[PDB]
Design a protein around this ligand. Structure first.
Ligand SMILES: [Zn+2]
Lengths: 37, 41, 279, 180
């Protein structure tokens, strides 16, 4: 069955939106004229 | 479990009584284990 | 040219209209001689029943979509005709900008009030001369931060920076000149419950970090060194006063704060531990 | 009061009126730094006065780093004399001081939040971005940096009287938003 996360919610909800934590995973990161003559 | 995220940003447990009094929606959050891979083929 | 209808009582004529409006009878009557001033009163609530000027202005438009009984060839010819007339107005940038800003705000789980304040700020800036570019990312991030500061909300620079890569410096300059635009068109306490929500702390530790934050704001010494470190060392002291264990590494990796900084502030904070006790 | 701001930097420009070649200048000179891949100008320094001059190929030179006006002018004449010693027909002309930077101390803490609230049309305080306050004075047009410990920085002036009038015009405002 589906497992229910029992934590204090605020941790998971902090990991949802902006959490001041970016990156941490690499994915889709992607003259003389005479001589010249 | 059912929860409510307010306007200031605090998220706490929800009860049906307070859900009816505050005109909220008795719902629960849903998460998914999202796995990503990169092939190079 | 005039066009202003003013109701007066020809029998009284002793004062400007000090009248009463009877809505149930549909009349307006002078409250002195009792003489009616007008019959057959119109309503504003009744015409509103069937049904945004603040943002869209006076512009009108109508969609063309497919019909119940129609062909798919005519739907494409009408949409391609509007695609050739879309250059007649330069308002395509407002709908796309509000669409992407809508996606970012919906991604940040911010309330609709901050969304409307940010859209209003971007509408105040729009396409002026002092902006002079910024590649549409910095005006959006700075507009979101402005809409956050107007709605009494608190979002750190590293949060929007974690959302959008605006390179900080150009973000600071665009935010500064944008603030000058807002001034030309004429508070760390809110951060405590947010980080207490990030750590999942009780209410007593939250209000204890509130009193600690205010008192530390009154004691001076160091003054702040940005309010984020004052917040994290305040919560650090208020959590080292009780027994709930998080240590310094977990709170330093969760709130993205240096351990040496929370210990450097915990030193002088422990020095000022005397006058910070609420009970 | 009785506090007088002390000058810290003076930026002036001197036009020589000729043209240069940079490999030969960087090859025959003594104390100089040149690298076209980073900055297309020779960084020449002298000991007395301890200054720094940026010399360009178009003859324009930037003498900066002096603590007084006589050190910037005399230092500029020393750089021009060095250029005339290398082998070019330079001429010390068009000496105009472009910037004057000073600093001082008021010896009391300053309320930056209340200062940014009362003088919101001239201040720009963002502690998370810069712990100091950026006060843009109208007359004279001086940019002042007001910190917490009392150190007052003054920049964006062409003369010394603009710095002195800026400090004399900012001192009562600092005395109003004090703490101890
Ligand atoms: Zn009447």
């Amino acid at each position: 069955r589906i497992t229910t996360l029992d934590e204090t919610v605020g941790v998971t909800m902090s990991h949802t939106g902006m959490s001041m934590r970016s990156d941490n995973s690499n994915f889709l990161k992607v003259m003389p004229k005479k001589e010249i003559l | 479990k059912p929860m409510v995220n307010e306007s200031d940003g605090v998220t706490h447990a929800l009860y049906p009584q307070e859900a009816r009094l505050r005109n909220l929606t008795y719902s629960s959050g849903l998460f998914v284990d999202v796995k990503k891979r990169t092939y190079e083929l | 040219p005039n066009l202003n209808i003013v109701l007066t009582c020809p029998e009284c004529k002793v004062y400007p209209p000090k009248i009463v409006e009877r809505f149930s009878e549909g009349d307006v009557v002078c409250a002195l001689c009792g003489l009616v001033l007008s019959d057959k009163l119109v309503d504003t609530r009744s015409e509103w029943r069937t049904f945004n000027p603040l943002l869209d202005g006076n512009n009108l438009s109508t969609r063309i979509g497919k019909g119940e009984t129609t062909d798919m060839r005519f739907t494409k010819e009408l949409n391609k005709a509007q695609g050739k007339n879309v250059m007649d107005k330069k308002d395509n940038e407002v709908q796309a900008a509000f669409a992407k800003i809508t996606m970012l705000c919906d991604a940040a789980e911010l309330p609709k009030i901050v969304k409307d304040c940010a859209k209003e700020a971007y509408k105040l800036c729009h396409d002026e001369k002092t902006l002079k570019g910024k590649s549409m990312e910095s005006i959006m991030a700075a507009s979101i931060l402005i809409g956050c500061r107007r709605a009494e909300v608190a979002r750190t620079f590293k949060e929007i920076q974690s959302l959008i890569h605006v390179k900080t410096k150009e973000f600071g300059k665009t935010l500064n000149i944008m603030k000058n635009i807002l001034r030309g068109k004429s508070q760390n306490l809110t951060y405590i419950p947010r980080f207490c929500s990030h750590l999942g702390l009780p209410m007593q530790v939250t209000t204890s970090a509130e009193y600690t934050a205010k008192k530390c704001k009154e004691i001076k010494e160091i003054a702040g060194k940005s309010p984020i470190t004052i917040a994290v060392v305040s919560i650090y002291l208020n959590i080292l006063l009780f027994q709930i264990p998080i240590t310094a590494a977990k709170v330093g990796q969760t709130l993205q704060v240096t351990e040496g900084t929370i210990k450097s502030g915990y030193k002088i904070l422990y020095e000022h531990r005397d006058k910070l006790v609420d009970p | 009061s009785g506090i007088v701001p002390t000058l810290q930097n003076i930026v002036a420009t001197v036009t020589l009126g000729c043209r240069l070649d940079l490999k030969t200048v960087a090859l025959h000179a003594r104390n100089a730094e040149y690298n076209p891949k980073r900055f297309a100008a020779v960084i020449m320094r002298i000991r007395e006065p301890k200054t720094t001059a940026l010399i360009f190929a178009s003859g324009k030179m930037v003498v900066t780093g002096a603590k007084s006006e006589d050190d910037s002018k005399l230092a500029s004449r020393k750089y021009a004399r060095i250029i005339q010693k290398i082998g070019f027909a330079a001429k010390f002309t068009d000496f105009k001081i472009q910037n004057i930077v000073g600093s001082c101390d008021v010896k009391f803490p300053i309320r930056l939040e209340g200062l940014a609230f009362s003088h919101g049309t001239f201040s720009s305080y963002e502690p998370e971005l810069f712990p100091g306050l950026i006060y843009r004075m109208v007359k004279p047009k001086i940019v002042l940096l007001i910190f917490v410990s009392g150190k007052i920085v003054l920049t964006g002036a062409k003369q010394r009287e603009e710095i002195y009038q800026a400090f004399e015009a900012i001192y009562p405002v600092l005395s109003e938003f004090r703490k101890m």
